[PDB]
Design a protein around this nucleic acid. Sequence first.
RNA 1: CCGCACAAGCGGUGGAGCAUGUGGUUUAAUUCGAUGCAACGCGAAGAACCUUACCUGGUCUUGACAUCCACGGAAGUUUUCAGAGAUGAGAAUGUGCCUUCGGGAACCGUGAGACAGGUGCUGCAUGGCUGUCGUCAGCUCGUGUUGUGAAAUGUUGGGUUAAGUCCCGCAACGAGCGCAACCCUUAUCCUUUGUUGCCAGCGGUCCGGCCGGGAACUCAAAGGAGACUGCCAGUGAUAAACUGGAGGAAGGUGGGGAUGACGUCAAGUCAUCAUGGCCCUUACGACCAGGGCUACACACGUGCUACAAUGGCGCAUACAAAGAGAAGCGACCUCGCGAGAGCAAGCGGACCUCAUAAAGUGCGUCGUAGUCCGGAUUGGAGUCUGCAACUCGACUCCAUGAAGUCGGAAUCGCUAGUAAUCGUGGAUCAGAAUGCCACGGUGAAUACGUUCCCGG
Lengths: 224, 82, 127, 211, 99, 114, 100, 147
Amino acid sequence: VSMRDMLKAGVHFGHQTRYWNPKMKPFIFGARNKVHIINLEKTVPMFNEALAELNKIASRKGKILFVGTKRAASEAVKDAALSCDQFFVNHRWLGGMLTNWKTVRQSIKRLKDLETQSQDGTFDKLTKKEALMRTRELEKLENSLGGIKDMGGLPDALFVIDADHEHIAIKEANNLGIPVFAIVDTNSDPDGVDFVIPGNDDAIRAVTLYLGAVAATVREGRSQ
Amino acid sequence: PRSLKKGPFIDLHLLKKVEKAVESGDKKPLRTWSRRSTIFPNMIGLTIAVHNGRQHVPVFVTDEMVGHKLGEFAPTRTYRGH
Amino acid sequence: NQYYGTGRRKSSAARVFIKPGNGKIVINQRSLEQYFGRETARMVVRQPLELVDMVEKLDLYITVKGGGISGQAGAIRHGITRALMEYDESLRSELRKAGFVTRDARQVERKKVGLRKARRRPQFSKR
Amino acid sequence: GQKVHPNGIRLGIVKPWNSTWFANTKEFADNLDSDFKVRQYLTKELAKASVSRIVIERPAKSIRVTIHTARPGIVIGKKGEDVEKLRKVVADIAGVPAQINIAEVRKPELDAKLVADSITSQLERRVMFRRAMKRAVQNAMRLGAKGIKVEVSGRLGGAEIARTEWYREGRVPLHTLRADIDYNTSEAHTTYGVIGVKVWIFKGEILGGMA
Amino acid sequence: QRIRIRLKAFDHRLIDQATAEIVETAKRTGAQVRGPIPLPTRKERFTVLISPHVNKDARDQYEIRTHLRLVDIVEPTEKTVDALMRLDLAAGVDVQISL
Amino acid sequence: ARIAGINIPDHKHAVIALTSIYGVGKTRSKAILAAAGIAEDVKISELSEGQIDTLRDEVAKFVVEGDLRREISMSIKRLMDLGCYRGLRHRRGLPVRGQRTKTNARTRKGPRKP
Amino acid sequence: AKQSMKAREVKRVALADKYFAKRAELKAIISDVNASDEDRWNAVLKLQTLPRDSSPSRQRNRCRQTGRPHGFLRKFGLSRIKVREAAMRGEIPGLKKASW
Amino acid sequence: PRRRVIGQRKILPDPKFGSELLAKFVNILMVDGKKSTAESIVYSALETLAQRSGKSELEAFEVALENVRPTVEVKSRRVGGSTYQVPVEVRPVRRNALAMRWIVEAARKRGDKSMALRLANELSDAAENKGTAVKKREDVHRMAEAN
RNA sequence: CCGCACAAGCGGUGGAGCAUGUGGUUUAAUUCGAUGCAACGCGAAGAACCUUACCUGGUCUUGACAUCCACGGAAGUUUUCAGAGAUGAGAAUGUGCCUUCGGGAACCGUGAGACAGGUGCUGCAUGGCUGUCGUCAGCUCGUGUUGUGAAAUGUUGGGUUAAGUCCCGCAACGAGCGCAACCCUUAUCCUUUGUUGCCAGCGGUCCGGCCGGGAACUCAAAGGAGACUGCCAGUGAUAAACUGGAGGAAGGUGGGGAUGACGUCAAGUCAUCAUGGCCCUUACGACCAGGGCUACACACGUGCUACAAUGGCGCAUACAAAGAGAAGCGACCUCGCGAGAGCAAGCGGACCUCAUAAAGUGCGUCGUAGUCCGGAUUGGAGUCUGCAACUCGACUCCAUGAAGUCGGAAUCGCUAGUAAUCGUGGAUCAGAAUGCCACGGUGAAUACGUUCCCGG
Ligand SMILES: [Mg+2]
Ligand SMILES: [Mg+2]
Ligand SMILES: [Mg+2]
Ligand SMILES: [Mg+2]
Ligand SMILES: [Mg+2]
Ligand SMILES: [Mg+2]
Ligand SMILES: [Mg+2]
Ligand SMILES: [Mg+2]
Ligand SMILES: [Mg+2]
Ligand SMILES: [Mg+2]
Ligand SMILES: [Mg+2]
Ligand SMILES: [Mg+2]
Ligand SMILES: [Mg+2]
Ligand SMILES: [Mg+2]
Ligand SMILES: [Mg+2]
Ligand SMILES: [Mg+2]
Ligand SMILES: [Mg+2]
Ligand SMILES: [Mg+2]
Ligand SMILES: [Mg+2]
Ligand SMILES: [Mg+2]
Ligand SMILES: [Mg+2]
Ligand SMILES: [Mg+2]
Ligand SMILES: [Mg+2]
Ligand SMILES: [Mg+2]
Ligand SMILES: [Mg+2]
Ligand SMILES: [Mg+2]
Ligand SMILES: [Mg+2]
Ligand SMILES: [Mg+2]
Ligand SMILES: [Mg+2]
Ligand SMILES: [Mg+2]
Ligand SMILES: [Mg+2]
Ligand SMILES: [Mg+2]
Ligand SMILES: [Mg+2]
Ligand SMILES: [Mg+2]
Ligand SMILES: [Mg+2]
Ligand SMILES: [Mg+2]
Ligand SMILES: [Mg+2]
Ligand SMILES: [Mg+2]
Ligand SMILES: [Mg+2]
Ligand SMILES: [Mg+2]
Ligand SMILES: [Mg+2]
Ligand SMILES: [Mg+2]
Ligand SMILES: [Mg+2]
Ligand SMILES: [Mg+2]
Ligand SMILES: [Mg+2]
Ligand SMILES: [Mg+2]
Ligand SMILES: [Mg+2]
Ligand SMILES: [Mg+2]
Ligand SMILES: [Mg+2]
Ligand SMILES: [Mg+2]
Ligand SMILES: [Mg+2]
Ligand SMILES: [Mg+2]
Ligand SMILES: [Zn+2]
């Protein structure tokens, strides 16, 4: 992504000067209208160097977890993961998703059992109310683990939108040593992101730019 | 009352003992546990020791007693008030 | 032609046959007011037939089993309702909002152990 | 609170009866009385054959018992001499031509009568009740059950007061009627009294009624 | 002339299988069988005090439901009557043949 | 009227009126009436002397009033003199037909005494 | 109950079993109108000499299992306690928890 | 009704007149489910009401009602630490019910050698403001102001 | 924040008579247990004998019940005397079966010891079973995270629900036992089968589905369908849910069952049974007759019938359901005023019998009274069961006709086919229901609300 490509999307935009985090000073161009302005001169090379690492991970058969829980950007992140055959979390990040993966494995097994059971049969043996209740449980499980049913094991890389909002995920990752790739607004604490991208995390246009560029480079890394 | 088609009921050993007594003149009070026997008209002028549960109390049968059961004359419950 | 309906109340059942032509009602080979001694029963059996206003337009041959006089009357009413519904669909829309296709499911509740009746509980003594 | 007998409540739903004859009020009482005498006799003779169950049917004239045990060799012995003596004594104890039958239980660690009998026989040896029931649960679970629960009660280890205690593992839904829960009790006559053991074994839910 | 056969049992699955088998044996032998007619079941109730002592309110209620079926054959031949005579059914079913 | 029972039956229906004689209940009342050929619903008013005399003639056929009271008192007195069980329960004013005395024998015992 | 009780019941049953015809014909004589009232008299005298326990009404239905005198169910011949144990185990055919 | 107060069975109207208020009246007078006995007395009383006290029996019904139906009563509630006799005004159904209750109780307090005559005379006196039901409306209006 | 907890209502209890249980006292003994809710129509689903365990007296000692050992007998059956019976003493008859002929079985009696026997003690030695909080909504665990750690979180919060029900939030995610559902029953429809059940259209009738017949309908009982907040509108973070509406037989877990988590009360039961310890072991065991459990100055609990014209009585007449039956249920007919009796059909029962429902309704009468209310009590005379109704049965008839005129303080039950009333059946049972368990008929009133009362 080129600085012009970002700037038109508005990547330079940031939170209010009232709400910023201390470690973000190096990445901040300045202030306008009491608004923090992010410096694309740092943003572009760091994003490119992160894309290099993501391409490397995906080119060694890496499993990638796209992470974002914004109600606006959930579908964008989900589609972003689907466009590169990867795994995602687009709703509330469940504390213990990585640290307590084994309990999630039982949940993934229950989701697999429910979907397989409906195709196999036995719904007729169940009463209509019971069969409908089982369908509701399957729908709830899908809304909870649609993205990670096929992750199989712990992912090899994480992509995070608004790292401050998803702070539990990054704490888990660091506890596991799983690398964190994150779009970091001025209000976030950048310590947990090993490849940090400072940029807007709310705006739909810039978020979609991040996701599309990452997914293009991930498909490229897969293709070899 | 039992019934009239069946006639009154008397225990056989009382029949035997009573006819023994009436045929052989006066006796001492003959002892009996048969509270369920009916007093019979031949059984008059005799004295019968009916067991009240713990002791044979003597009842001296008379003519207007005929028809009643022996147990009606030997109370089985001691009571004097409180 | 012939139009029947099966009505039921708490424990009664009533077969109702509708024949256009008059306003006579025969119940178990007897006339209405000579079968039912209570007036509210006569009223409740004429209820639907008078609602749809066609009284002297169709005579009724009806039999009924089980239950008491009020249950039999209610079952007869339900049967007449279902029979009329077969004769004309338009009548059913008014019959329903009159509360006649209700088929009330209310029935005597069983006696339960430890109670004197379905719900009456023995007279407890605190002191 | 007190629980309902987890076998009687499932009778007709998922659990079959252990006596399937038909009778009238005339011969109903003495029929099941001879039935009881048959059962007690068989349980006394087969005390070492690990008999899990004893079903009795009564066809038109004869009676036919089926013995579910894990030691079919012990009840069979050699060319069925022992089972033939059993046929004689059963036929004369019921006044009717008998017909004995055997059906081996294959997983003696998954039926509640045999695990309870094993626990009691161990409690005779004055083994630690704790490790006894723990081994029972571990075996039954490892063999493929969906859940199990054991409960011993009464002066455990010769103690002076009764300490009822239990240990469960897996999933034992006692309120679900579909659940095929094999339940059975047993008593252990120790020197300090009687120790009662109850065992529940849940082996999956049954879908589609009795059949 | 007719042969009327009554079947009593304690569970309806077994008795229904028995009726089916009866009528099929009668169909093999070219008879005319009135299909099994269901007759009213007899529920015997029993209420029993569960508590050994003191509690009379705590009880338990049991029920034996005798299921009863009636089959009737109107054009019997020797190969009809013998066929059901060479017929052995489940132990739980009581059969009663009448002419 | 001055029936054999020297009491005076009231001016009600003949049967209910005759029931006032001691020893004449409803059954025996209508027996008296039917045997005298007198109607059932008529009152003692509008009843001729020729009919009252038949009523007296037919009520004299029974044992009523003092004669009945004397017979009942004699039977109880005789029964008491025998020393039989019911004689004792009559002397002690306690129920003789085998009812509870542990509680509610109040008709025989009268009101309560602490 | 005590073994002597079960023994008394066995003796009563066995005794009432052997004198049944005698009791029946004596009762028939006694109740028979048109008896000569000498026959009826010696009939009642002869009847009251038979063993008291030869009366069917002297017997008392006890649990075949435990011999308990109360809580009997003629249908099963067991007390109220043993029927429950037998039913929950599945020994009484067709019997099950009723609920309506 | 701690969670939600539930309404009443909307009773079915009188078969003789199609009115539902006379239906509630016959339900009030009914004893031991003897509805036939009740409606007999009610019809007998309204018929003679239509004669001894002018025409319009169904109208004379409310002529007695509006004469007895109260407006204010007391509802002793302890919103201040003790049961305080605070007065309250009623909805229409409350005063309807209290009116019919007060009618039937006074009728039962008359004798009059019949319940038909009892109810008839009592309802007439109520319609023209005589008797005891009207007096117990007077007292319920009197003690409603006493505190 | 919940619950008939109160409130709002309706009917009661507390007063009267009787039924029954307990306490008390008495007694020869009034068997033993249950004791605040959660003992007190409870164990006992049924004490005249029996039961029965208690008492008085009469009796037995390897025993009434079981195994073993020798010895002798077939086993039985019938009959007499003494006795209250247990028991003794006999007299007659039979002396059988299988046999490898030796005996053996079958039982019976006598003898001797192991032993039997105990409803004797301890439920504070126990199992088993049950009550209770409470069908109240809770109780936890794994893994994760935080803390050196004991631990905490989850399970708190905001909503909502009958519910730890569900949603949203939240370092928690999950699960398990509970909750809900699966089960039974009830409400609608469909399919299949149609006698002993059914009778619409048919013909025939003695007018009776009774008879040809019919399989439609009611029913019977096996399969299925149906209800899910699915549809609509409105509230609500849009969510959960809530309020209404449509359709529908049924609407918001449709009604009612069964189902009772972790635990609490050293709760109840050693007298169902089983059982550790101990105690008796010619006695704390066993048999028999009679008595008691039914006593009565009293006290309490639970019921029944009442006090009346919304009723009593007489006559007439209509509509149920659910059950039981072979030492059983027992029709028709005759006899009796009646309880019942004689004769005897049918029925192991959709067939026959119990068995004609009652309140109701029509007509007549009674006129507010201790009554034509009420039926207690008592006298007389009967019937039935049963060896036997004295103690101490039920019922019938005639006579008698108490108290009682709606019950102080206080207190109980109930939210709909409920309460209240009205009959019917069953278990136990020879006989003995006002109790218990079921069944239908008629059929309400009220809920402003959560301040208080009780409990959670
Ligand atoms: Mg039957
Ligand atoms: Mg009389
Ligand atoms: Mg008595
Ligand atoms: Mg014993
Ligand atoms: Mg008896
Ligand atoms: Mg209450
Ligand atoms: Mg109140
Ligand atoms: Mg009282
Ligand atoms: Mg006592
Ligand atoms: Mg009770
Ligand atoms: Mg009792
Ligand atoms: Mg002695
Ligand atoms: Mg002698
Ligand atoms: Mg000896
Ligand atoms: Mg011993
Ligand atoms: Mg305890
Ligand atoms: Mg609940
Ligand atoms: Mg909350
Ligand atoms: Mg839950
Ligand atoms: Mg939470
Ligand atoms: Mg159908
Ligand atoms: Mg035909
Ligand atoms: Mg058909
Ligand atoms: Mg069905
Ligand atoms: Mg609608
Ligand atoms: Mg609606
Ligand atoms: Mg539902
Ligand atoms: Mg439900
Ligand atoms: Mg449940
Ligand atoms: Mg329970
Ligand atoms: Mg204790
Ligand atoms: Mg207790
Ligand atoms: Mg002794
Ligand atoms: Mg004795
Ligand atoms: Mg007693
Ligand atoms: Mg009277
Ligand atoms: Mg009549
Ligand atoms: Mg019976
Ligand atoms: Mg006659
Ligand atoms: Mg007769
Ligand atoms: Mg009867
Ligand atoms: Mg009457
Ligand atoms: Mg009448
Ligand atoms: Mg009087
Ligand atoms: Mg007075
Ligand atoms: Mg008065
Ligand atoms: Mg409620
Ligand atoms: Mg009743
Ligand atoms: Mg009986
Ligand atoms: Mg009754
Ligand atoms: Mg009822
Ligand atoms: Mg409180
Ligand atoms: Zn941001």
